[PDB]
Design a protein around this nucleic acid. Structure first.
Ligand code: OIY
Lengths: 150, 117
RNA sequence: GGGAAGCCUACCUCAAGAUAAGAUUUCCCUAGGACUUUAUGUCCUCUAAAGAGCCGUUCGAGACUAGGACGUUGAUAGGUU
RNA sequence: CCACAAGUCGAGCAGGUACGAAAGUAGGUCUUAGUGAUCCGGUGGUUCUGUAUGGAAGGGCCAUCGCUCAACGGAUAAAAG
RNA sequence: UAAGUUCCGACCUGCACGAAUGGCAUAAUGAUGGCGGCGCUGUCUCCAGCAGAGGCUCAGUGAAAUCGAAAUCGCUGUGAAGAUGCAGUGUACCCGCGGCUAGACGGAAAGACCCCGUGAACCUUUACUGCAGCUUGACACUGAACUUUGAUUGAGGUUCUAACUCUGUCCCGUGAUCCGGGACGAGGACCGUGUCUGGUGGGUAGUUUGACUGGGGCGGUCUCCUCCUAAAGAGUAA
RNA sequence: AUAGCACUCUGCAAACACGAAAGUGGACGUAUAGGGUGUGAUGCCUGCCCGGUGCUGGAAGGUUAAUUGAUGGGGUUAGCG
RNA sequence: GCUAAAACUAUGUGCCGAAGCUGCGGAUGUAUACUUUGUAUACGUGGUAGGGGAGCGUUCUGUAAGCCGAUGAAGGUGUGUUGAGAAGCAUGCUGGAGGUAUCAGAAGUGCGAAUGCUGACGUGAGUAACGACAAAACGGGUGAAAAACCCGUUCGCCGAAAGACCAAGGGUUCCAGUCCAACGUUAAUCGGGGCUGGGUGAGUCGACCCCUAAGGCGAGGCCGAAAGGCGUAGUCGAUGGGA
RNA sequence: GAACCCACUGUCGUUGAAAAGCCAGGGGAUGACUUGUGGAUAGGGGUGAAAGGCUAAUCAAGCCUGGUGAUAGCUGGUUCU
RNA sequence: GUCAAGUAAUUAAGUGCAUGUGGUGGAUGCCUUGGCAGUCAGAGGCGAUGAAAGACGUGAUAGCCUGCGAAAAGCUCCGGGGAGGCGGCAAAUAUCCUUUGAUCCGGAGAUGUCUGAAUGGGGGAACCCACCUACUUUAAGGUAGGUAUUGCAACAUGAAUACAUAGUGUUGCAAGGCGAACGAGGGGAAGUGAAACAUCUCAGUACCCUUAGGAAAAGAAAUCAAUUGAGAUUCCCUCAGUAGCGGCGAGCGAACGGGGAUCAGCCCAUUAAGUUAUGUGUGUUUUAGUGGAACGCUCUGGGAAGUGCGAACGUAGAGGGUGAUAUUCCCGUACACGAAAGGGCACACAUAAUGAUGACGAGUAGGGCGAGGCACGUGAAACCUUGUCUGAAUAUGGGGGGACCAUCCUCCAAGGCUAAAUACUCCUGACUGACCGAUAGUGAACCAGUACCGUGAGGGAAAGGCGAAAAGAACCCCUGUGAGGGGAGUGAAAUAGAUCCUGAAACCGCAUGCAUACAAGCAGUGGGAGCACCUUCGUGGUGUGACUGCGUACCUUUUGUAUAAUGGGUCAGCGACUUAUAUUCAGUAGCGAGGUUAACCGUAUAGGGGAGCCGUAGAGAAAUCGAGUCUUAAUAGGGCG
C-alpha cells in the first residue's frame, strides 16, 4: 500500500493506542492481512483414473440410452436449417455430435445452434459428455474411441 | 469472494434487542448492555424454575397448617395421622381443599385424629 | 435510704413530610337539563365564593428565591418644605 | 537403577596364566566418594578407504593422550565497569 | 537574647585542612550564603470598612476533561484482606438553586522508585577483540667512486651527480603569487611513497560483564560420598 | 571566563588543526612568536618524596618480526635383487 | 425477643428441609440382542487448558438459454409459526429490479472487548467563557428589526505613540454601488465578508544599469575507485561607491 | 538614569490573552555593547567565556525516505451452533 | 340531622415502559465511463531540425478543463462520409456555416511565443544585458542569419629557443539531457539468526556510481571423462538436500551422468561468416471506411423486451442500448468488399562502410609474500584473479586430470567476431477473470499527488446515484421582494423537489394507554392484584405492573475478583491461524509386486515423453558378503536382521 513508512505518533505519552504505520491492516485504508496472489488451480489426474472415468461415463450413457449410434452423419451445405431438420428427425434436438473428423459444413451449420455442439472423436471430455442431453456418435467415431479404449 | 457482514450482523443484533424489550434505559437500546441483560435473565429463569417448586410447596404447607390449627391439630400431627390412615392425598390438593371447602378439610382432620388415636 | 461537673429534666433555638401528616378560633360555597357505564357516573347550560397569585412602589429581608409593608378609602418610594 | 545420555551386580563359555598335593581360588583393594560429554588435534597398531591408474597425502577402525570446561549436562578459542 | 542546634571570638585528640586539583589574608565590587540593629509597617494579636473586576439574575452565542450500565443513604460485620450495590439493622416524601471538597482507592500520563528481560542507548578503563593514526626493519623506486673495520661475508666513513626534492631566483605560455615547460641555485641516493612486517594504539568501533536468593545488593553456595530430617519397601524439600 | 603566573612543545616547507589527496588555517606571522596544559587581581608565600605511572637522556648485554635458507627426515622410480 | 426457655444435659415420638433419591413426560451417548432396520434392556450425559465428532448461516462457480419476479426481486420494518441450536417458513406495510432450489466446488465466511481504525451522535450543560477595568450618554435618519451603522450635541483615553512615514513581508485587503445565508466570539442596515464595476501615469523617487566586499561558481589546471574536492585567468554577488 | 539589551524576587495566570506571558519591583546601559542585511561551518559532524548547552516549539547523537511487515522467551486481542 | 371511630376514590412538577408518527444520520440492497491480475500479438525509445516537464497567451459572451501557438478550439492538399454543425463543465442566447459537400474521420504538409541539456554573457526558471554580417527605414528602429563547451580532422598562425614543440585561431563533423523494468561493470551495510556474542549468518541483499541493447552477457576446449568415451555458449527437469563445507554450531550446499529447449560456426594483413546504412524490386501487414437476414396479434402495465397464440433468419443466438427481461426496434455480429497517401516487417539485388592497428600471441605461464573467488571458513587444498617482488620453455615444447611423483588419457593460454533457445513491460491493439464494487478496488471512479501540513527533503486526505424524459414546479398565499413552507401544476411515483434511489442504528421530539411523590442497592427473574383497549366473551389476546421470594455486570489475568485490579461513552461499517513448497500420519479413489511421470512437444485438461522417484534386503566404519552379516583364534557366545 502507498505510503505508511513512518511511525504515526510517539510510542508513549499521547493517550492513543500504539501504532507503527498508518497502513496497518487494522486501520481503514490499510493493507489486507493476507494479500492474495495469482494461483494455479490445475490438479494431477492419473492417466488410468482419467481413462477409467471416461469408460464409466460412456457405459452409463449407454445404460441410460442417452448415446445414439448412427452409421453416417453429414450435411450437404453449411446451412443451419438442414442440420436442425436432421437433428429433429433423429429426435436429438439438444445434442453433442461426435464424428471421426469434423467437416467444415457441419461445423458451420452447428455453430449457431444452442444446446448443440460438434466434436472430433479424439476431443471428447468428461464434462461435455455429461452436460448435453444426448450424444450422437457415428460408427467410425465409436470405433476410434474403442481403439483409444475410453 | 469478499463477504460483507451487514445483513447477518444486523439480524443477530436486532434479535437480541427484540428479546430485550421492556428493560430500563440502555438495557433495551444499546446492544452491549442488552446482550448482558438477556443472558442474566436466562440464568435467573433457569434457577427460578427450581425455586418455584419450593415456594409453592411452602405455601401449601402454610395453608394446611392454618386449617389443621383451626381443626385442633398441628401440621406435623395431621401429616402423621394421614400417613397412618393410609391417605395419599398430596399437599397441593390438601391446601386447595383447606382454602375452598372447610367441611371436607374438617373430615380429613377427623380421619387423621382417628388414626392418631 | 443517702450519694457526683456524669444520665433524664430544667435554660435557649428549631420542630406535625410526627404519611401516626395533631389541636383551637373565625370565614366561604346549598343551580338547572340529558343519558347510561345507576356511579364521589359521562356530556350540556348557568355560576367563579372566602382567598391566593401575576403586576407595581419597595424594605433595617435578600445571590435568585423566600419573608415584611403598601397600591388613591394611599405616606410604599422619589421629590418638596 | 533409570527422561535421555549414563551408572551397578553378574553365574557361565573359550584362550593364556599364578598359587595349591588336591577339591579349587583369582577379570584389583570390605563396600559405598577420589570426577568431565561432544568437537579439535597428538601417539602406537591396522587383511578398511585412497577423486584417471600404481603409490602417497588425507580419512576410517582398535588402543591411548591433552580441560579447577569446579557456574562441575561443559552457550565463544577469546570479554570489566 | 528573658530564653540562641544559627552567628561572632577563642580552644586543638584535624573520624577525614594544607601550600599553583595552590595556602593564609585582603581595600573595592556582588539582584552571592549566614547573623544582628534603627526606622517602618495588616507579617501578626485579629481582623473591620470602603472602591473596581468576577461570582449571582436576565437576553444572545456556546466549550472541556470523563463516561460498562445505574431506581448512585448511615452504621456494624463480611469479603481478592479499607463496600452506594453482600448480611443484619437504622434512617429516609418527589425535584432544583447557591456554596463545599470528607469519599467515589476522583481525572490526567500502559510508575520515572524497585525487580525482571540471556532488552536499548551513551560514557569510562591496566575487560575482550578489531581498525585509523604514529613508529621499526626488509624488498622496490635507487646510482657512481674511493676507503676503514668485524666474524667468504657484514658494517662504517668520505666524495660525486644523473634518479628524486624545493610552500628559492629568473624567462616564456600570459593581461596570471594556479599550473606547465626552460635556465640557474641549494639539497641528494638521503627524505619521501608502495608491498610485507614487529611495536604502540579508549583516538575510534562492535560487544561481554552467571544463576540460586523469604525483594535486590553484600555475604554464602553451584559436582561427588556418609548420617538425620524421611512418617519400619523405594523416593521425598528448605 | 578574565588580566597576572608557571610548565611544556615548536628553527619555519614550524609545532598544531582540517582533508582521502590536492591543498588550507597557523601567518602574508618567525622564539619579546605560535600551540597545548594547569593556576587565577594583589600582599606574604609556595615545605618533603623520583619507590609507582608517564616523559627526557643513555646503554648495547638478554629477548624478539618479516626476510634468508644450513642441515636432518619422508613421498615417488631408473636400476639392483 | 427468650428464664418450670425459645438455655444446658439425657431419652423418645413426629415433621420441615437440596438441582441427592423416587414418580410422570421428553432428548441424547455406549453396549448387548433383534441374525437389514430403528425397536427393547442395561449403564452413562458438571466441566477450564485441551483432544474428538456433527452441523447452521454468508459471498462466488457449475448445474442454470432452467426456476421465481412490475399480478412487485433484493433491502428495510412488524406479526404469526417451526426445530435441540446456529436458524427456517409464511404473511401485512415500505421498496422499485433483480433473486435463485437441489447437489457439488472455492473462500476476503460469522466481532463486544485489542488505551483497535473511520464516520455519526450523546453526558458534562444551556454549565465555563465572549481576549487588556481608556467609558460612555442622548436626539434625529434609514431599516423587518438599531447598545454596536450614518448625522448631530456632550463625556472620556493616547499624544517619544494608541500620531505621521520607509524597508522587509503580504497581495487587491484600496474606491464606489449592492446584498446579509456562511465568516465577525452577540445583533448588524455595518465590515479587511459575498457580488459587480473602477483605481497604481516618472529623464530627476526606487529598481534596472556601471563598480566592487564577505562569499559562490569556475575555461585550462592539480587531486581523487566513480560521484566528486580545490583552485588560476575570469564571472557573479549589496548590506557599500557612481547624473 | 530613559530608549535598547537582559531576566534576580513576588502575586496572578496553569482547559492561559500567551505551547514560557502580564503587572510591581530589579541588572547593564561607550562596551568582552546592542542591532539590520548578506554570507561560512552539517550529524559521532558542526558550534560552545563549558550548562551535555544549541543545531527550525525536536537533541547523551537532528529531520526525511528507504533496509522494514527489524526482532520482542513480554503485554493485549482472537468473531456461529 | 350532629359527633366519633374505621376505611375507599381522587394530584404529576416531572419520570418509566409499550405503541403510533416524525427529526437527525447515512448503514444496507441494487448499480458503475473507476481499479486489480493476466493471455495473445506488436513495440522497445524521445532530444541541438531543441526533448521530458512547464510559464504565458489564444474564444462574439470566457472562469476552469481540452485543443492550439501571434497563421493560436486553428491554415493547405489528398482520401472517406452524406444532414447537420459552431470542443466539455453547460444551459441559454446572438452572429452564423453547410448538398457549389459543412461538422466529423484518416494520411501528408505549413505555422509553432518564453523557460528548461538551454548552448551569445549573466541570472532568484519562464527574466536582465549584448556583439558581428547583409538588406531596409529616417531618426533613436525593422527583417534574416551567425556568436556555448569539449573531442576529432583539415588549414593558418606561433614562445622560452636555432630547428621544432607547447600555445592560439577558423571551418567541418560529433557528444551532453530525459525516461519504466530487464543487462554489464565500479563500491557495498546493519537490523536479524546463532535462543548471549566476536568466526559465521543476513548477503554480494538494501543502497550509491558508470554505461548499453532490443535484449544483454557467454560462446567454438591449453573443457570434461576414466569400458577410453563426449564434443562451443545459454535456459529448464533430475541427479540431491546426496558428496562435501561448517565456533563440525546456527547454517551453507555442488559436480559427474541422464532427459529436454535451441542449434552454427567463421577469421588474423591480396583479410571470413556476420552486421549496419542507402537505393530498387516483390510479398505481407497497418493507419479512415461500405453492405450486412428475419415479428405480428393479445393481456397486465406509466412504459413491454414480460403473459398467451402463432411466424421468420441463422456461416449472424458475441455484446451494448431502447420507459421492466429483445436473434427478428436501434448500433452491431457471421460473412463479403475497400486505399489519394504514409508507416512496419520479410526476401532479393546494387553501392558504401564495418567486422579488421589484427598476421599463432613474454614481463606472458610459473614462483615468494598479502588478499579475493570457487558449495569448499587454511584445511591433505588442487584450480581461477592479482596489489607487491620476480620470472621460463617456446612443439624433441607446453597446460590439466583436487597435496605430490611416475605412467597413461586429454587439450594448445598469453589474438578476435558470431543468430537461437533466456530476462523484462513506460507503452499499442484485441480478448479474458469461482478479481473489487465507493470504509472495497490505485493515494486518486468526483478538476488528486489536488486541498491541507512542513524552511525543505517529504507527508498526504475527504468527496459517486432526482427522473425514462427537466417535463427542474407558470400562477396564488404567509414572510424582510430573505430563508422556509401551504396550495396549484408536471410526473407512474414529489415522504422521487434539488447533498433529491433505498433511508437501518446510536441520539432527539410529539401523541395515546398503564404505573409512579413513606420508600433504600447490577434494575432482572419466579409469582401476582388492579386498570385500558381488543375480543372467537374465556380456563382468551395486547399494553402496563401495586405487592412479594431470590438475586453484588461483562472480559482479561489469576491460588483466588462485586471487587476500590485491566479494557470498553454509544451505534454503524472494517479488524486477527493465511499462501507456496517439502515431509509424516489418517480418510478416500485408481492400479497392485508393482505404482508414477518431470521438464518438454502438443488446435493443448486429451495424446505422447520412462530420464528420474518410491516399494521389493539386510549386516558392517568400510572393502566386502548376502537370508544372512558383524564381532572373534572360535562353527562358541552375543548384536542387528
Ligand atoms: N407547492 C409548493 C410550491 C412553492 C412555490 N413553487 C415557491 C417555492 O418555494 N419554490 C421552491 C423552489 C425549489 C428550489 N429552491 C429550486 C432550486 O433549487 N433550483 C436549482 C437551480 C440551479 C441548480 N443548482 C443547477 C444544478 O445544480 N445543475 C446540475 C449540476 O450542474 C450538476 O449536478 C452536480 N452533480 O453537481 C449536473 C450533474 O450532471 O446536473 C445539473 N442539472 C441538470 N439537469 C439536467 C437534466 O435533468 N438532464 C440533462 C442535463 O442538463 C442535466 N443536468
Amino acid at each position: 500500500v502507498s505510503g505508511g513508512g513512518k511511525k504515526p505518533f510517539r510510542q508513549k505519552g499521547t493517550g492513543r493506542a500504539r501504532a507503527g504505520s498508518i497502513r496497518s491492516p487494522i486501520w481503514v485504508g490499510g493493507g489486507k492481512t493476507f494479500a492474495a496472489r495469482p494461483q494455479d488451480w490445475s490438479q494431477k489426474v492419473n492417466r488410468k483414473m482419467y481413462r477409467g472415468a471416461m469408460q464409466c461415463i460412456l457405459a452409463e450413457l449407454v445404460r441410460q440410452d442417452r448415446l445414439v449410434l448412427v452409421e453416417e452423419f453429414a450435411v450437404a451445405a453449411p446451412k443451419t436449417k438442414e442440420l436442425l431438420a436432421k437433428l429433429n428427425d433423429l429426435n436429438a434436438a439438444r445434442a453433442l455430435i461426435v464424428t471421426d473428423a469434423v467437416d467444415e459444413n457441419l461445423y458451420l451449420a452447428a455453430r449457431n445452434l444452442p444446446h448443440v455442439d460438434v466434436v472430433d472423436a479424439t476431443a471428447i471430455d468428461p464434462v461435455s459428455l455429461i452436460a448435453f442431453d444426448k450424444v450422437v456418435m457415428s460408427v467410425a467415431a465409436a470405433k476410434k474411441i474403442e481403439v483409444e479404449l475410453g | 469472494a469478499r463477504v460483507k457482514r451487514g445483513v447477518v450482523a444486523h439480524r443477530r443484533h436486532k434479535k437480541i434487542l427484540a428479546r430485550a424489550k421492556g428493560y430500563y434505559g440502555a438495557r433495551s437500546r444499546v446492544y452491549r448492555v442488552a446482550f448482558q441483560a438477556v443472558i442474566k435473565a436466562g440464568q435467573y429463569a433457569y434457577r427460578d424454575r427450581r425455586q418455584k417448586k419450593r415456594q409453592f410447596r411452602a405455601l401449601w404447607i402454610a395453608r394446611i397448617n392454618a386449617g389443621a390449627r383451626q381443626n385442633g391439630l398441628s401440621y406435623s400431627r395431621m401429616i402423621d395421622g394421614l400417613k397412618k390412615a393410609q391417605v395419599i392425598i398430596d399437599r397441593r390438593v390438601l391446601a386447595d381443599i383447606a382454602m375452598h371447602d372447610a367441611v371436607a378439610f374438617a373430615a380429613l382432620a377427623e380421619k387423621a385424629k382417628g388414626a392418631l388415636a
